[PDB]
From a paper:
Specifically, Prx binds directly to the apo-form of ComR preventing DNA binding in vitro and acts as a repressor of the S. pyogenes competence regulon in vivo.
DBD:Prx cocrystals were obtained with both purified minimal DBD bound to Prx and after in situ proteolysis with full-length ComR complexed with Prx. Analysis of the DBD:Prx complex interface reveals that Prx directly interacts with the DNA-binding surface of ComR. Furthermore, residue D32 is the focal point for a stabilized hydrogen bonding network that positions Prx E44 to make a salt-bridge with ComR R33, Prx D38 to salt-bridge with ComR R37 and for the arginine side chains to be further stabilized by hydrogen bond interactions with the Prx mainchain. If the DBD:Prx complex is aligned to apo-ComR using the DBD, we observed that Prx is unable to interact with the DNA-binding residues of ComR due to a large steric clash as this surface is held tightly against the TPR domain.
Residue numbers in the entry:
A (entry chain B): 1 to 66
B (entry chain A): 1 to 60
C (entry chain C): 64 to 68
The structure:
């Protein structure tokens, strides 16, 4: 379940000193807009985006689940 | 990539209002939407498209 | 339903 995903990924990103743009890399898999929507809870994370983000932040997806 | 569920949620939550919406395409494929308050970079290609036609295309 | 509501 991914209801608290946005807050956790924002915390971990800020911890690692990364901007949203750095997480999104070439934006081929994730736009900065989409990451912003997930972090604020505007958009529910989908599986492909959640797994991409977890990998970019260096953790298994299980670190970020509810 | 834009999931049909993501688009439908943006409509349900009242972020995508009205009959048309701004769309970013990459490699011919729908890649994202753009809300009025959001920004796009210079290399992103934005088109105004009909909400119902975007839904058709995403449902495929 | 709609945001902020």
């Amino acid at each position: 379940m991914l209801k608290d995903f946005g807050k956790k990924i924002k915390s971990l990103r800020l911890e690692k000193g990364l901007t949203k743009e750095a997480v999104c890399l070439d934006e081929s898999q994730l736009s900065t807009r989409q990451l912003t929507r997930i972090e604020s809870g505007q958009s529910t994370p989908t599986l492909n985006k959640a797994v991409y983000i977890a990998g970019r932040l260096g953790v298994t997806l299980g670190y970020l689940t509810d | 990539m834009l999931y049909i569920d993501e688009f439908k949620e943006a409509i349900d939550k009242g972020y995508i209002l009205g009959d048309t919406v701004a769309i970013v395409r990459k490699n011919g494929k729908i890649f994202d939407y753009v809300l009025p308050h959001e920004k796009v970079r210079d290399d992103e290609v934005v088109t105004v498209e009909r909400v119902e036609e975007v839904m058709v295309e995403l449902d495929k």
